[PDB]
Design an enzyme around this catalytic site. Structure first.
Site, mmCIF file in Angstrom:
data_model
loop_
_atom_site.group_PDB
_atom_site.id
_atom_site.type_symbol
_atom_site.label_atom_id
_atom_site.label_comp_id
_atom_site.label_asym_id
_atom_site.label_seq_id
_atom_site.Cartn_x
_atom_site.Cartn_y
_atom_site.Cartn_z
ATOM 1 C CG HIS A 119 -1.878 1.170 1.218
ATOM 2 N ND1 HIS A 119 -3.247 1.036 1.019
ATOM 3 C CD2 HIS A 119 -1.650 2.515 1.349
ATOM 4 C CE1 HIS A 119 -3.780 2.276 1.032
ATOM 5 N NE2 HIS A 119 -2.846 3.207 1.230
ATOM 6 C CD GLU A 120 5.514 1.043 1.724
ATOM 7 O OE1 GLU A 120 5.872 2.106 1.175
ATOM 8 O OE2 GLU A 120 6.168 -0.022 1.762
ATOM 9 C CG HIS A 123 0.291 6.508 -1.063
ATOM 10 N ND1 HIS A 123 -0.744 6.966 -1.860
ATOM 11 C CD2 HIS A 123 -0.284 6.045 0.084
ATOM 12 C CE1 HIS A 123 -1.885 6.783 -1.212
ATOM 13 N NE2 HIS A 123 -1.597 6.213 -0.007
ATOM 14 C CG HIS A 129 -6.659 5.775 -0.507
ATOM 15 N ND1 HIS A 129 -7.016 6.683 0.475
ATOM 16 C CD2 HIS A 129 -5.599 5.072 -0.016
ATOM 17 C CE1 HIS A 129 -6.199 6.525 1.506
ATOM 18 N NE2 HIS A 129 -5.322 5.526 1.200
HETATM 19 C C1 LIG Z 1 -2.411 5.325 6.463
HETATM 20 C C2 LIG Z 1 -2.377 5.002 4.955
HETATM 21 N N1 LIG Z 1 -2.164 3.548 4.783
HETATM 22 C C3 LIG Z 1 -3.410 2.781 5.076
HETATM 23 C C4 LIG Z 1 -3.236 1.296 4.646
HETATM 24 C C5 LIG Z 1 -4.602 0.641 4.313
HETATM 25 C C6 LIG Z 1 -4.403 -0.720 3.656
HETATM 26 C C7 LIG Z 1 -5.431 -1.284 2.879
HETATM 27 C C8 LIG Z 1 -5.251 -2.536 2.283
HETATM 28 C C9 LIG Z 1 -4.052 -3.231 2.459
HETATM 29 C C10 LIG Z 1 -3.027 -2.676 3.231
HETATM 30 C C11 LIG Z 1 -3.200 -1.422 3.829
HETATM 31 C C12 LIG Z 1 -3.783 2.817 6.582
HETATM 32 O O1 LIG Z 1 -3.006 2.417 7.435
HETATM 33 N N2 LIG Z 1 -4.980 3.286 6.908
HETATM 34 C C13 LIG Z 1 -5.502 3.353 8.326
HETATM 35 C C14 LIG Z 1 -6.523 4.515 8.438
HETATM 36 C C15 LIG Z 1 -5.789 5.864 8.603
HETATM 37 C C16 LIG Z 1 -6.804 6.999 8.835
HETATM 38 N N3 LIG Z 1 -6.085 8.319 8.952
HETATM 39 C C17 LIG Z 1 -6.677 9.488 9.193
HETATM 40 N N4 LIG Z 1 -7.990 9.585 9.354
HETATM 41 N N5 LIG Z 1 -5.937 10.573 9.289
HETATM 42 C C18 LIG Z 1 -6.164 1.998 8.716
HETATM 43 O O2 LIG Z 1 -6.745 1.315 7.882
HETATM 44 N N6 LIG Z 1 -6.088 1.616 9.994
HETATM 45 C C19 LIG Z 1 -6.649 0.432 10.403
HETATM 46 C C20 LIG Z 1 -5.948 -0.403 11.285
HETATM 47 C C21 LIG Z 1 -6.511 -1.615 11.706
HETATM 48 C C22 LIG Z 1 -7.776 -1.998 11.245
HETATM 49 C C23 LIG Z 1 -8.479 -1.171 10.365
HETATM 50 C C24 LIG Z 1 -7.920 0.041 9.940
HETATM 51 C C25 LIG Z 1 -3.692 5.508 4.297
HETATM 52 O O3 LIG Z 1 -4.710 5.533 4.975
HETATM 53 O O4 LIG Z 1 -3.652 5.856 3.123
HETATM 54 ZN ZN LIG Z 2 -3.173 5.237 1.228
#
Ligand SMILES: C[C@@H](N[C@@H](CCc1ccccc1)C(=O)N[C@@H](CCCNC(N)=[NH2+])C(=O)Nc1ccccc1)C(=O)O
Ligand SMILES: [Zn+2]
Ligand SMILES: [Zn+2]
Length: 173
Positions: A119-120, A123, A129
């Site tokens: 994911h990272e 970017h 997204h």
């Molecule tokens: C932080 C960054 N990376 C995501 C990764 C999501 C992902 C999806 C599918 C496969 C792998 C990774 C992330 O970590 N998102 C967080 C939400 C961040 C919200 N930030 C804000 N409002 N400022 C996330 O999904 N956290 C999470 C942890 C555990 C369970 C469910 C959600 C993003 O939100 O763009």
């Molecule tokens: Zn993201």
């Protein structure tokens, strides 16, 4: 997927990356694996290539940090932001930060690192997204009964390819 003001795209296919630091949970090779994996995941849907540098300044210098770590995106404990990353470019751009203040795993049991890494890196590569839930670039964690089969959705490829695009099959015409 998305672009940017100037269109995200590296001027070279032979990219380099490096993990500056690891997490107090996984082993070194294991962590690097997440990247090695994230990279390959995209390598499958781009002509791009990657290489590790035991020393020096790689293009993609993946570095974790807890709490504040420059810029304005202060981590905080486990959960929430698992890992964030910026568009491609010098400085903050191209880099990718994870949460060191969080548990990590090498499979579907913890917070699959690779899963998060792919994911990272997205970017970093030049896409954000997407408009699919099966996509890993989606703004929500997504797992599978067997991640060993995991794949990026067409939504993801749409961009990663539109910005580049690998060659066709060799054994053709
Ligand atoms: C932080 C960054 N990376 C995501 C990764 C999501 C992902 C999806 C599918 C496969 C792998 C990774 C992330 O970590 N998102 C967080 C939400 C961040 C919200 N930030 C804000 N409002 N400022 C996330 O999904 N956290 C999470 C942890 C555990 C369970 C469910 C959600 C993003 O939100 O763009
Ligand atoms: Zn993201
Ligand atoms: Zn950061």
């Amino acid at each position: 997927f998305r672009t940017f003001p100037g269109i995200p795209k590296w001027r070279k296919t032979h990219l380099t990356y490096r993990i500056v630091n690891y997490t107090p949970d996984l082993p070194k090779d294991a962590v690097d694996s997440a990247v090695e994996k994230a990279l390959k995941v995209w390598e499958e849907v781009t002509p791009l290539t990657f290489s590790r540098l035991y020393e020096g300044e790689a293009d993609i210098m993946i570095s974790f940090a807890v709490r504040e770590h420059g810029d304005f995106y202060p981590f905080d404990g486990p959960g929430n932001v698992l890992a964030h990353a910026y568009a491609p470019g010098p400085g903050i751009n191209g880099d990718a930060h994870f949460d060191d203040d969080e548990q990590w795993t090498k499979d579907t049991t913890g917070t699959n690192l690779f899963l998060v890494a792919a994911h990272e890196i997205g970017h970093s590569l030049g896409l954000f997204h997407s408009a699919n839930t099966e996509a890993l670039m989606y703004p929500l964690y997504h797992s599978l009964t067997d991640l060993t089969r995991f794949r990026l959705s067409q939504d993801d490829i749409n961009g990663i390819q539109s910005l580049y695009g690998p060659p066709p099959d060799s054994p053709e015409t």
